[PDB]
Scaffold this active site. Sequence first.
Site, mmCIF file in Angstrom:
data_model
loop_
_atom_site.group_PDB
_atom_site.id
_atom_site.type_symbol
_atom_site.label_atom_id
_atom_site.label_comp_id
_atom_site.label_asym_id
_atom_site.label_seq_id
_atom_site.Cartn_x
_atom_site.Cartn_y
_atom_site.Cartn_z
ATOM 1 N N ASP A 201 24.026 -16.573 -2.696
ATOM 2 C CA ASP A 201 25.421 -17.100 -1.587
ATOM 3 C C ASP A 201 24.725 -17.756 -0.781
ATOM 4 O O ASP A 201 24.627 -16.904 0.329
ATOM 5 C CB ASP A 201 26.403 -15.990 -1.835
ATOM 6 C CG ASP A 201 27.628 -16.784 -1.465
ATOM 7 O OD1 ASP A 201 27.118 -18.178 -1.020
ATOM 8 O OD2 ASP A 201 28.630 -16.305 -0.820
ATOM 9 N N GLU A 238 21.313 -19.508 -3.500
ATOM 10 C CA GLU A 238 22.274 -20.325 -3.641
ATOM 11 C C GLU A 238 21.975 -21.681 -2.313
ATOM 12 O O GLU A 238 22.020 -21.068 -1.473
ATOM 13 C CB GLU A 238 23.727 -20.161 -3.518
ATOM 14 C CG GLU A 238 25.171 -20.750 -2.825
ATOM 15 C CD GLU A 238 24.292 -22.138 -2.371
ATOM 16 O OE1 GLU A 238 24.416 -23.296 -3.776
ATOM 17 O OE2 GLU A 238 24.695 -23.239 -1.977
ATOM 18 N N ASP A 301 34.463 -24.046 -3.338
ATOM 19 C CA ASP A 301 34.179 -24.221 -2.288
ATOM 20 C C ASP A 301 34.136 -26.237 -2.977
ATOM 21 O O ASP A 301 34.275 -27.173 -1.365
ATOM 22 C CB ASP A 301 32.543 -24.757 -1.784
ATOM 23 C CG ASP A 301 31.921 -23.837 -1.383
ATOM 24 O OD1 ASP A 301 32.623 -22.099 -0.803
ATOM 25 O OD2 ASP A 301 31.198 -23.489 -0.426
#
Length: 453
Positions: A201, A238, A301
């Site tokens: 992440d 990510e 997001d």
Amino acid sequence: DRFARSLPREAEQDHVYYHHAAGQEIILRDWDEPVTAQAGGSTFYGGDLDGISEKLPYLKKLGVTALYLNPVFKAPSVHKYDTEDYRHVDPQFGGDGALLRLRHNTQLVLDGVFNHSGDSHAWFDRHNRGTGGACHNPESPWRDWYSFSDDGTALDWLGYASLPKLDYQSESLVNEIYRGEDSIVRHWLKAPWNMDGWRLDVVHMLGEAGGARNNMQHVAGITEAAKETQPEAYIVGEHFGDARQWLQADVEDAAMNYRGFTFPLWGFLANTDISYDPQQIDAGLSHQQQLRMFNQLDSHDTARFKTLLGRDIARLPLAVVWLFTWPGVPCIYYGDEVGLDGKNDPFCRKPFPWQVEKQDTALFALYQRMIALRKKSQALRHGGCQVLYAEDNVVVFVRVLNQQRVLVAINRGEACEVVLPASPFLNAVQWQCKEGHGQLTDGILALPAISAT
């Protein structure tokens, strides 16, 4: 949270506790009720544990096999970026024993929250749930996971105080993170449960201002780590950005894709940015990962397709198909095929319903057969990739290698423009049947039919 409601005990009541009071008192909301819960709180709706076992008759029978999923441990929040307790599965889910069967029931996917940390984590624990208190004391097994200044605010997760930033290096942390036996991923990589995979992440920041070596031997180290227990081990990391520290084979074997599908082609289909900044559009990473990289719809997001859709039913079953002929390892955005909405975070985040999923709703028996076709067909799996007709209100292209075929024709327009998708440079017999209803290769151009759009 939006997925399915297994338990009313792991379903916490409203006012049940707080988080970072305020940390105002919990607010729930009925199914088909709005997305962010009422003033004096939020939130907290679907995604519990026992039901997917009996929702893989929706997911996995006969469609899905493994599930790309968000972070899975303690944070009080609906999202849980800030881990509190690590090894045991977060209570809201439940634990890891009505779970333990479940990845073998699922016989699945997962995601790591490890990048950010908990402020109210069970060791350092401002608000002091843990026993440790680094927020007070410089003498504990859990203190130097951060360095100094140990006060009100500084550099952490794009500067978030609740999500502190850890002092990550070797041989130091990641001992309960990836590496070790204690590590939970490696604390979950085995029988009976063994982990098909996991996910990173926005670690593009990792390590000490991210995008230095720190970011990636942290990672490279995990590759052999991948290759230690399971050859099946499959990985992501990510970064919004173009992939590169994303893979080298040396670096990765997979990664996440805004840039892949989700940011490129809406301009074409959902007309614009994922951010929802309009786009006008008419007509790098190694072989393995190509048919390996992750591929989905919307997120927490950004905005959602219908907002982008010409308020047009047509637009998405169209768009969805583009995800089928597509390579990488898709991990679709649920409601990807059903027609649902999701306003702007945490509205985007939106309950998984029942009713509009009917197959009169032409969604079903599109996205259904459309995956199923890509599972009849590996030409939409490991094939080569050609690109074909450049037309306003058309697009063509193929996947090409040495055992089968699929080219894919599309019509942009409110009304047809007759196209003739030729497969001579194809070099496979003409006048011949190509399963559907139905076509001849004849004329070395495909003359068939599919509705306006």
